[PDB]
């Protein structure tokens, strides 16, 4: 029931009904046909295949696909066909979800940082940053002053949005009116998995430290948390909110590292003095029926 790293933390359990989430954002939506699925299934990176094998095993659980891009009408009929083929699979589109509660004008972020740096003496200020901040503020003369819109290219286009979907979590399926959603409530969460994370066998009920757990891709001795696997027990889990606060306050903040990785370290007060490897062990989404980071022994779907 309870675990610990620096204090006693309440391990949380997840109804197998806990849904799983896959995300595909395609910049060139034309590289594929205008009647077949706009998801990549290369012999080097078979993602739609992996997202379909996963659905076949956890049929009881819901499996969803958060997708975005200027797709063709025939490509839309294609996802609907997957929805008919598998009731397990529900495809959600960024256009059908409101993230307005998760946003902050780019203007404020800069002016707040500018005020803070201005307060301190000029000796203690960061001239470079204030220069960067003042330049960027003027260059938002374009009508768009929204952190969300700013995150529209493609690394950011999806990273920030992956975090925003997990902030909604189970609320995402409900907000999108995903039929077949007759096993989940509103505080439900969802487990995010890169599509190159292969589900060898049903995971079943899981236990996540302090109601949260994330994949940790350790290297030579060193270990690093990853946003490839995001397991939350409740929608709007507070670690993600801490990362959203970093997006709200920090300038040039990386959604991947400041949005989740740095947000998790605040929720558990890593403290730096404490060993990071063990803390990564403590946070580590562990599983034996999941093949983690397969693009790795094959190839990265992204040029960038
Ligand atoms: O055009 C792209 C490329 C990647 N992804 C997402 O990013 C994940 C990571 O892909 P991959 O494992 O190939 O990259 P890497 O592990 O090298 O970061 C994929 O599973 C997708 O969910 C996406 O949505 N669109
Ligand atoms: Mn990968």
Numbering used by the authors: 28 to 180, 183 to 333
Original authors' sentences:
All N-glycosylated NleB/SseKs form a Type-I-turn in the DxD motif in the ligand-bound state, and the pathogenic NleB1/SseK1/3 toxins also retain Type-I-turn in the DxD motif in the apo state. All solved N-glycosyltransferase NleB/SseKs structures were revisited to analyze the characteristic topology of the catalytic DxD motif and this analysis was extended to all structures of O-linked bacterial glycosylation toxins to determine whether these DxD motifs follow the characteristic topology. This revealed that in all ligand-bound N-/O-glycosylation toxins, the backbone of the DxD motif forms a Type I β-turn, in which the four residues (labeled i to i + 3) specifically form a pseudo-cycle C10 H-bond network between the backbone CO(i) and NH(i + 3) groups, and that the first aspartate binds with its next-but-one tyrosine, named as the YD bond, which allows the DxD motif to optimally bind Mn2+ and the donor substrates. In all apo- and UDP-bound NleB1/SseK1/SseK3 effectors, the DxD motifs lie in the 219YLDADM224/221YLDADM226/224YLDADM229 regions and their quaternary DADM motifs form a Type-I-turn by H-bonding between the backbone CO(i) and NH(i + 3) groups, while the free Asp oxygen (Oδ of Asp221/Asp223/Asp/226) in the DxD motif interacts with the hydroxyl oxygen (Oη of Tyr219/Tyr221/Tyr224), named as a YD bond.
Escherichia coli NleB1, Citrobacter rodentium NleB, and Salmonella enterica SseK1/3 type III effectors fatally glycosyltransfer N-acetyl glucosamine (GlcNAc) from UDP-GlcNAc to arginine residues of death domain-containing proteins that regulate host inflammation, intra-bacterial proteins, and themselves, whose post-translational modification disrupts host immune functions and prolongs bacterial viability inside host cells. All NleB/SseK orthologs have a typical GT-A conformation with two abutting β/α/β Rossmann domains unlike a GT-B consisting of facing each other β/α/β Rossmann domains with a flexible linkage and share a high degree of structural similarity. Several structural cores were revealed for the new arginine N-glycosylation systems: a catalytic DxD motif to position the Mn2+ cofactor and UDP-GlcNAc donor substrate, His-Glu-Asn (HEN) motif to select UDP-GlcNAc as a suitable donor substrate before other sugar donors such as UDP-Glc/Gal, C-terminal loop to stably embrace the UDP-GlcNAc donor substrate, and Helix-Loop-Helix (HLH) domain predicted to select the acceptor targets. The SseK1 effector GlcNAcylates Arg9, Arg190, Arg160, and Arg149 of four proteins involved in methylglyoxal detoxification, namely, GloA, GloB, GloC, and YajL, respectively, and catalyze methylglyoxal detoxification to significantly enhance their activity.
